[PDB]
Amino acid sequence: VNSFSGYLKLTDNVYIKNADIVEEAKKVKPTVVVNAANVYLKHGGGVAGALNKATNNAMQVESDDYIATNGPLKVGGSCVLSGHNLAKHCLHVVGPNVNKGEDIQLLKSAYENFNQHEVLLAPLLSAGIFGADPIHSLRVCVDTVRTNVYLAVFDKNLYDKLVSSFL
Ligand SMILES: CC[C@@H](CNc1ncnc2[nH]cnc12)NC(=O)CCC1CCCCC1
């Protein structure tokens, strides 16, 4: 038993809620919150800009030191950093950005990072400003992630859609 509330159960291991991941994060203090990162860890907008703002820019300061030491992530890759005031850890995961021409096949590789963590609070990778179809993203999530994932879909119209079309 864990502390997530109000989720709809999609499969054995995937759950979905209409929620603001920042607010869900501040209430659950999950062990892991997933950020929809880019390779430079420049958290300017979307989920990343919201998570970072909620940390009063501490996420960005930590991220800039990470990049200065290690260089950029790979598309499809990830790193574990602090969760600051939102979670124990933040798993920064880079899904492909269709608005940058990146290969959508890398979305499966991105979701594979979730399997290194038993339970995660996460957004749909490559959704929103990353330009992928959130329904395809949900299908890849369900078919790739084997650990327990709690998906927060900020928008209500899209949520209800994702549920109604789910196979
Ligand atoms: C689907 C991916 C999410 C990712 N963003 C966040 N997800 C969770 N919590 C957040 N807090 C701040 N941002 C988020 N994007 C949206 O819902 C934007 C609206 C839809 C409307 C339909 C077409 C695609 C864009």
From Swiss-Prot:
It is a multi-pass membrane protein. It comes from the Viruses. It catalyses: Thiol-dependent hydrolysis of ester, thioester, amide, peptide and isopeptide bonds formed by the C-terminal Gly of ubiquitin (a 76-residue protein attached to proteins as an intracellular targeting signal). It is found in: Host endoplasmic reticulum membrane. Inhibited in vitro by GRL-0617. Residues 1-167 form the Macro domain. Responsible for the cleavages located at the N-terminus of the replicase polyprotein. Participates together with nsp4 in the assembly of virally-induced cytoplasmic double-membrane vesicles necessary for viral replication. Antagonizes innate immune induction of type I interferon by blocking the phosphorylation, dimerization and subsequent nuclear translocation of host IRF3. Also prevents host NF-kappa-B signaling. In addition, PL-PRO possesses a deubiquitinating/deISGylating activity and processes both 'Lys-48'- and 'Lys-63'-linked polyubiquitin chains from cellular substrates. May form homohexamers. Interacts with N protein. This is Papain-like protease nsp3. It comes from Severe acute respiratory syndrome coronavirus 2 (2019-nCoV). The chain holds residues 1025 to 1191 of 7096 of the full protein.
